[PDB]
Symmetry: D2
Subunit: 300 residues, 4 copies
């Protein structure tokens, strides 16, 4: 099933266009560092500001670069059911392993609306489907009872990126759902507490920067080394916090740009960090590289 560490990749831009050299190198750095899979064109990838063909083209490059070496679950959700079906269908044609479907944002559908929304997309594809609950961005929550009904009637709904900020929600999901069902953390700071109560991995932002250390955190816990896992969690925790110092993906793309790895190009309405937050992030980036160097036996 679906377990481990998945990277929600940024969409690297150069001169107003997709920077393909940047994507290749970033994808290679992930594959080389024990990452289980990639989520292209989600929130971290600035999907709202991609054109439709850029959305499709970003999934196409990712598939071509990765060449089946690790898994790809493309972000293909929408707050239009028809649009999510069309985006999901186009991803299946490219040749992905599955899709990640954020719950409809902004129009706040009822739970029965969510049931028919996700069932209509699930029925439209043979692809495995990960649901994605993030009330803070969407204005609506996928209730546990809705997830359970969805999985009862839709065999290809296999898991959930749970980003509700609530570890209690994970326990509720494990109580209500089969256990082949994969609960993944959607928040780097909460992965270890989610794993402790039955999640099996993470859709990560921080692994854009530190793929082997983030990936080691999950492996350490899953093989029964909770104290070494906690050690790595404490090492990365200040980074986990400052990667949301302003709205993701501005910190993580700024951080990659401070490394030689991408242009600091954002599409409006995202804007660069305010100067004091830029300095905090810069400092946390550096302490993080120091702290990791001292605990290298945990992750290298």
């Amino acid at each position: 099933k679906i377990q481990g560490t998945y990277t929600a990749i940024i969409s690297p831009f150069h001169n107003g266009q997709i920077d393909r050299k940047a994507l290749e190198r970033l994808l290679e750095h992930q594959i080389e560092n024990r990452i289980d899979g990639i989520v292209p064109v989600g929130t971290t990838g600035e999907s709202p500001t991609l054109s439709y063909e850029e959305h499709i083209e970003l999934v196409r490059l990712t598939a071509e670069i990765v060449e089946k070496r690790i898994k790809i679950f493309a972000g293909t959700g929408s707050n239009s059911t028809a649009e999510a079906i069309h985006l999901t269908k186009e991803a299946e044609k490219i040749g992905v392993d599955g899709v990640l479907l954020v719950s409809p944002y902004y129009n706040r559908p009822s739970q029965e609306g969510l049931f028919r929304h996700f069932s209509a997309i699930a029925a439209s594809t043979s692809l495995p489907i990960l649901l994605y609950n993030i009330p803070s961005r969407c204005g609506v929550d996928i209730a546990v009872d809705t997830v359970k009904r969805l999985v009862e009637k839709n065999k290809n709904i296999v898991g959930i990126k749970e980003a509700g900020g609530s570890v209690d929600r994970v326990s509720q999901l494990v109580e209500a759902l089969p256990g082949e069902f994969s609960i993944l953390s959607g928040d780097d700071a909460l992965t270890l507490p989610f794993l402790s109560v039955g999640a099996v991995g993470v859709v990560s932002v921080a692994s854009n920067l530190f793929p082997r250390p983030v990936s080691a955190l999950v492996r350490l816990y899953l093989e029964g080394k909770p104290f070494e896992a906690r050690q790595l969690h404490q090492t990365l925790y200040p980074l986990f916090r400052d990667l949301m110092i302003e709205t993701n993906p501005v910190p993580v793309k700024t951080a990659l740009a401070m490394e030689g790895l991408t242009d600091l190009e954002l599409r409006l309405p995202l804007a660069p960090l305010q100067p004091q937050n830029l300095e905090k992030l810069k400092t946390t980036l550096s302490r993080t590289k120091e702290k990791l160097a001292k605990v290298e036996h945990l992750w290298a």
Copy 2:
């Protein structure tokens, strides 16, 4: 001069397409019932599930039906700045009075991001612009100081649909902004308290059903008749409540469909009301008409 009652109209559907005949009828019913203007293709018009071409077409039809008899502020916002600019220009070409720009939803831009987003659209158009603050659907709020800078640096930002659920926010806006800035209620149930501290009208959902009473509520306060306005507020209040019994526009479109004015056609992810909520809506509708019949001198 932005003052009075503006109706956020439903988008009437028939057999999967825009129902032009129903749209004609709804618009004439508004014009004949003392409505100051129309807001096509906002939330109430199910903008997320319209195709781009449908979005422009609904705006074209509204303008063609209305012929300048009342004002039109078209919904042209997006969580992509480039997309909002393009929608706004298409509206300018159709020939509207102005544009209403919801804050970017889902990607949660920083305040500076919101400043640049709205500033770029304003600089792109000659139309007057109403900002639209609704964090429960967007996941972000337009801070008072951000509204203040927007108006300082963009002469065509002339008002706001304030739907943050907070009347105190209105007192802050009036304190921070020039008296000429027009604050409109975005929540029918808060219209009267917003007016009491300096708002000048409403972008209304309830006016879809009861245009004359909602419009009279605002006029009564503006003509210095607070106790009669309160009488009307209190007459309509249970209806205002039940138009949110599930996510707008499901109640209001269901109510119109029960009146024979449109098909009860909703695009997924919106779904019909739960049966117990349908019953509440039905009885509240009839109860409201019964009560309006008794206070006819206030609104008729």
Copy 3:
């Protein structure tokens, strides 16, 4: 019926004890400036840090000084039903006009618990009772249905200080309760919007400093002058805001001490303002006095 402006007075302290001269001066200033009544030893009076006998003495001193010239509703609430009964009976023996009963804080009773709590206190006394809903401090809200049941069964429950921060609560309360039931603002900044949907007065903090203008604000609205009322509201609004810059009563007691009217003696766990908030309060105080002088025809 209970209407108009009631001042939740500070408990003036001097050298660790009740300051009787300061209390007398403050009470006389209230009586001279069109205040309808006094609420001694509520939150603004630091009820948590008074001894029982200090609690009894402040209520007795207030009754003795006022000598029935204006009304007294004494704060006698507790999160212990028995202690609230005892406090209420003591106030009745002193001879007040009524009592203000905050909902239980900290132990978070169910709605049925609230109904039994308030019903038991109401049954123990012939005094009129004002309920006091303030969820931000108590951790619980008095539901509208609970207020309605309490009034059905306890004829001496005559109103509520509504401090839930929600004007919509006022509309629900007026829907559910008879006209003789009095809803009072518990938040100076929301008094005017509360009035517009059916409140009939305020239990005020600001009136400690500016009794005539605050009481004029309420009278202006109740006599059908909504725009003079709004004008006074906007004149006072920044003061209303800064009297909550930190938890009441620190700002209002700090303001009165700056006027030489009481000692800035606070009992722990309350502490003086942070210096930046002190400066903001000081500057807002000065501006308010001059602005009030320029609209003196509205309140003098």
Copy 4:
């Protein structure tokens, strides 16, 4: 240090008095089932509705019964600093191992106020002190920087019962404070995730009913057996959830009464469960016992 499972005990009442034989039975059952210590007269013990005599007497009886076999940390907090000092000093003379200090409730002191409040109580006793953060009941949060300042200046402040409902707060606490500082879960459902990021125990409600399974949950994680701890967590999670179905201690005391172990004598304002919630608890209780049987090798 302070590590493991401490039981926040109910206060067994009978006919308006302390049920001392029931207290003996409850205490012996804790000691016999691998419980590390007792927290008498906190929220679970209905401290708000105990007289002062009962508050002190319950701590004396607990101390006399326990005879130093396990630890006692008495609840001695108050929203009056002077009152907290007095309760804390009566516990010191009785001879407890420490005290638990809830933050002031209802009067919402500033952070600086919290600093002086807890520092003043810490200075008044040589006893170890656990802070107790529960904003949902108090209306105020003990900020991380405030905890950090308190510990810098008060050597006897040795840990915190963290009941803010945020696992992230634990990670922040570990980042900011010395490892010797003991963070204890204050929420049974969050104990395991708290432990995974560095908490070292629990102040538990559920251990009133299942002392050995709850204490085994903590021990298993602490001795590096995360998957067995997770098994026990999922066995108990529905009980953890339903012990908060209404405000603690109504569920736990109802459960104990149904087991014939104490009279369900609640002092108003606490009220018995709504009948549908009593039904949920009853079934969860039976299911919990059934499930505990199958993982008995984990906790027996």
